[PDB]
Structures are given as C-alpha cells and as structure tokens.
Symmetry: C5
Subunit: 103 residues, 5 copies
C-alpha cells in the first residue's frame, strides 16, 4: 500500500502533485443545486476544488468526499500548513484527490 | 465550473453577492417545527438564513444545507472573518447559497 | 420568515424567552435508556434540557435535536456567551426550542 | 425529568456517582472487532469505559453511545474538567451512563 | 473487559504495541477510489495507516474506522501527544487497531 501522498498519486492517471507548504488562503463552500462543492486557494493564486458528487461516485467515495471538505474547512480555520496536494488535472479547477499536512 | 464565489453566484437566478469582510455578530439556531434553521447577523445589521430543508431539496442538497449550518456555527465561534456571501434575495431574510472566508 | 429569536419564539404556543447573556455553567450528557439527553445550567440556577428524541416526531426534528446537543456542547467548551433561549415552558427543566449567541 | 446527574443516576440499577473534578488523564480508542470502544482514565487511577454497541442496543442507544465517545475525546483534548460520572458498577471498567462538566 | 491498550492489543493476532509518546508529524488523507485512507507519520519516519474499508468490516467496524480517522485528524491539528498504538503488523504500512493518548 502507498506509504505517502506521492506514491499514492502516481497510482492514478491524470493526477499531479502540487507542493504548497503554505496555509489555505481562502475557503469557499456552496450548497447551491448541482454546485455542492468547496474551493480553496492559496496566496500564490492556485485554486483547487473538492468535486461535486456525481454519478462517477460510489458510496465509499461519497463519504471520503464529505470527509475531505471537513478536513479543508478545519485546516483553513486553524491555519494548518498543507504540504502537498495530489490533484486530477483533467478538471478545472484541479480536483483534489489527496492532501498531506506537515506542521 | 466556477473558480470563485462571484462566478458561482452568477449561475443562479435572484442571487446576489454581499461583501461583509466581517465576523458574524450573532448566531441563532432553531429546532422548532418547520423552522429547523440557523440565522446569522453582522454588526452592520445584515441578517441571513440557511433555509429549512424541504420538499424541493434532494439528498445531496439536504446534506450541503447541514454542512452549511455546521460551517456557520464554527465560523461564529472561531470569529472567522467572512468575506462574501452569495444569497437568494427573493427570500426574507436572504437565504445563503454560498460563503467565502479569507485568511 | 422570523429574523431573530424573540420573533421566532412568538410563533409557538406557550413558549418563553430567557435572556441569559452568560456562558453555560455546566453541561450534563446522558446516554441512559429513555433519558438520552443533555442538561445545561447557568450560574443563576436556570436549568434547561433538549428533549429526548421521541418516535412520532419527524426525522428532521430528530436531526435538529442532535444538532442542538452538538451546539450546546461546543458552546460550553468554548465558553461562548448565550444571549437568549426560547423554551417550551410546559416541561421541566424547560425544553430548548432555539438559542441565540452574541457577544 | 431529573435536573442534575445525581438525581438521574438514582433512577437506574447498580449505578454509582464518582466525583472527579479533574481533567481526563488519558484517552484510548479502539476500532478492533468487537472492541469498538473508548476507555478513559484519571490521575487518581479511575478507569471508565463506553460500552461496545452490541446488536442488543435500541435505535437511540447506539446514537447516544457515539455522542458520548465524541464528548470524551473533545473533553480530553480541551482539558475540560469532568465533575461527576454516573457509571453502572457491575462492569469492568465501569460503564459510563452520564457525565457532568462544570468549571 | 480489557482495561488499557496493552491488554486489548494482546487479544489479537498479528498486533503489536508501539510506544511513541510524541505528536503526529504528518497527516495524509485520500479520497481516491480504492485508497480512501488516512496515513500518519511520526518524526523518526515511522508510518501507519487506517485501512480502507471493505465488507470484511461489518457495519459497526466501518463506523469505528471513520471515527479513528476523525481522531487522528484532530490529534494532528491539536498536536496531541500520542502514547501508544496497537497495530496489525501483517500489513504495510502497519494498520492502526487502537490508539492511546496521554498528556
Ligand atoms: Cl439500569
């Protein structure tokens, strides 16, 4: 099993690692129909999204998605340093697959 | 897919962006019949609500609504600065569609 | 729609508003059979409870009751000032209907 | 309804009130099969548990049990002083029925 | 029945206790298909995972898995000192079965 975010990311197609080593700059949350999502940006301008649960989402992935949004909201409020993001680059904003935080 | 709240807001009818750049002054939560909701106000007097989950709302929307109330409660308690709010202006108080927080 | 706790409290029968403007003094939680509830008191001796979830009332009522217990616990831990409580006075301790927090 | 932990505890069989007036010394959590539980200890050596949710527990019981585990974790991490604990003393460690927290 | 993490860990096969007495160094969360897991690291490099769910995990087991992920996330965010870890050593990285935290 992957021991870290980098090996984990290399296991999928259309994913790429982003090394930020910085806290989340802004956090956006929408409850709007068909746009139930979260968007975070960093000071340098990089924007990422936690993708809206569509048909392409099982039931085990639906829970991890809700988990990710909880993680991002609390990481933002506590000014936690996000180290890396593994994202799907075939989507705009890039969609978050994984996150790693290191104090 | 919107990259920010302003663009995401523009995709709906009767919406409106409010720039508060202020912490929530008050938080009111009700569990009373057919009024299971949260109401927030800012020092400027602005009052907003998170609509009661009802008939129109499907499941992904019912949980986004629950997440929004969680978000406002934790934002109120941590004194987080709310930047903008996308609201449906055809309701009173205006109902919240999305929220952005910055730094 | 009601825009504050006093107006919302008035739409119900035999309710009453309590102005505390103080933090919760103590928080009691019970998982014991038929008394799965939370009880809070203020330094002045006022004691309030969140009703135990009964079958006949709808599940949105059940979610709101659960949220209210989450809200009281975190308000207690963070020493948040509670402004007013709207309660059903036909119960003792008085059962909470709504709560407002403001500093 | 009971208005405090002492009165509530006296409504059950084989219960006992423990007065701690101290923060939880340690918190243990287990996800191992049939040992899904939380165990807490205090400086004075007292050890208490939250029972595993067997398929004997009513609907509301399983949910109150999950809440208690959330409460113990957050009380531990915030160093919240625990006032009294009502436990069923016919189990080892004694099983928690109710908890009161007061400053 | 078991009163601490050591006794509880000894009740399983392929488990072992790790004494760390230190805060989590890094936290990794993944929402990716088949890798919906959490990975933690300590300062000396030691890595542990909370295993991805499956039908092997009865429903009560899946709840405890979700709870553990929540616990590691706030423990990391709060820099809480983790004392011991009971892990399954037949997997790589070693899978977490129980955690104990003592300040
Ligand atoms: Cl009993």
């Amino acid at each position: 099993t992957p021991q870290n975010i980098t090996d984990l990311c290399a296991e999928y197609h259309n994913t790429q690692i982003h090394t930020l080593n910085d806290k989340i700059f802004s956090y956006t949350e929408s409850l709007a129909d068909k746009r139930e999502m979260a968007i975070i940006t960093f000071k340098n301008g990089a924007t990422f999204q936690v993708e809206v649960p569509g048909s392409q989402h099982i039931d085990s992935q639906k829970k991890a998605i809700e988990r990710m949004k909880d993680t991002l909201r609390i990481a933002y409020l506590t000014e936690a340093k996000v180290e890396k993001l593994c994202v799907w680059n075939n989507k705009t904003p890039h969609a978050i697959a994984a996150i790693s935080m290191a104090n």
